[PDB]
Design a protein around this ligand. Sequence first.
Ligand SMILES: N[C@@H](CCC(=O)N[C@@H](CS)C(=O)NCC(=O)O)C(=O)O
Ligand SMILES: N[C@@H](CCC(=O)N[C@@H](CS)C(=O)NCC(=O)O)C(=O)O
Lengths: 209, 209
Amino acid sequence: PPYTVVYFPVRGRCAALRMLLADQGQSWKEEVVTVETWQEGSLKASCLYGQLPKFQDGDLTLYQSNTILRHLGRTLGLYGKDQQEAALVDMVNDGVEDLRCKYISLIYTNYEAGKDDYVKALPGQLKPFETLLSQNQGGKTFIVGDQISFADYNLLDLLLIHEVLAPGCLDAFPLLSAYVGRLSARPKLKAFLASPEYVNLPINGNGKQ
Amino acid sequence: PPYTVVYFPVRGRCAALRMLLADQGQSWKEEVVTVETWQEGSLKASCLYGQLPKFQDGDLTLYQSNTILRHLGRTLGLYGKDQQEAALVDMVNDGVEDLRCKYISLIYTNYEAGKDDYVKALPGQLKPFETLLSQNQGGKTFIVGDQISFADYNLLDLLLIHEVLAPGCLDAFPLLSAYVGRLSARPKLKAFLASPEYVNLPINGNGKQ
Ligand SMILES: N[C@@H](CCC(=O)N[C@@H](CS)C(=O)NCC(=O)O)C(=O)O
Ligand SMILES: N[C@@H](CCC(=O)N[C@@H](CS)C(=O)NCC(=O)O)C(=O)O
């Protein structure tokens, strides 16, 4: 176990990277931080931007969930076959991040009064991803190219958490639906998604989803 | 190359990539999109995520400002000397992006009532960058390593727009102050920042800054 993930006991911004590690057959150590430990102050005080996750790869300490993903994509060969693909992978990931931010604000700042709006606008937000798939070998493979990239794990998590928020939201999108099923069927990932370490963790830190 | 930048006639999310292109001796064509043109709908409907900027590098069309920056970073040698530096460059850029997002929400949604609170919390938001500089050879050169990266351009823009929003905000940060002074003095960058094509564009589209 050369990697260490320091985070709160929630899926949140660490779910995609955990899926990547699990699917890639990589070993890691989870350093769980409880709300109490956080409230004490010291740890937050040591974090670059005062937030988690924190990640250790040997002697290298990183912060920022997308920085961690790009790092693993870079060192594990999950960043496209060439520079042209690397750019498309980034483009996809940034799009995922944008929607993730909107999702986070809903959950933490206006879940009750904003849900219906969010849900009605959701299909307009998902359409771009359906488009990218239709444009890459008829959506029969990955989001970019013929190989899995760190953007697939991030997109998959986004899709999964949206199905929980708005059941059947992928029904109008044939390629996204098939994509989720296909990736979810990968043996190592399938086992992980069914394990207690994933299943018994809440999606968000406030219990809403 | 060559490159085509498609954006509204404002600095905004295109300022950093323009500074990079100018300073690194690149040439690009600016395709200005007027609000009247945007509101008509044809171009927007064509944009992957329904938003600008759009960037062309031959037949490679990209969207997402940070994707454009990383693309230029890896093709122009502005992404660190190795994998560890690349990770650090990403960490800095994601931090800049987080703060830029807060700045944009302030500008577009709560300028009048939220400015004071924002400014009061600004020192805490800038401290991590002052810290990063101190950890890199006492902050005598660049944000990461001893050669310029795309993160330097993005960070420079963030600091420039904050000095306009809150005059004197960098006075408390000696390393960040000196850093902005060094970078602004770079010949090509200096000339660009003094030119009409930069100076005569508003920072943000809604006329607030
Ligand atoms: N851009 C950062 C954001 C990290 C973040 O928002 N962390 C939250 C949890 S999702 C946190 O640490 N909150 C604790 C605090 O702000 O005190 C990333 O993507 O890693
Ligand atoms: N994550 C995108 C955000 C782009 C963005 O916010 N674009 C705005 C202008 S700054 C836009 O195109 N607004 C027009 C619209 O949404 O209709 C990026 O970083 O490029």
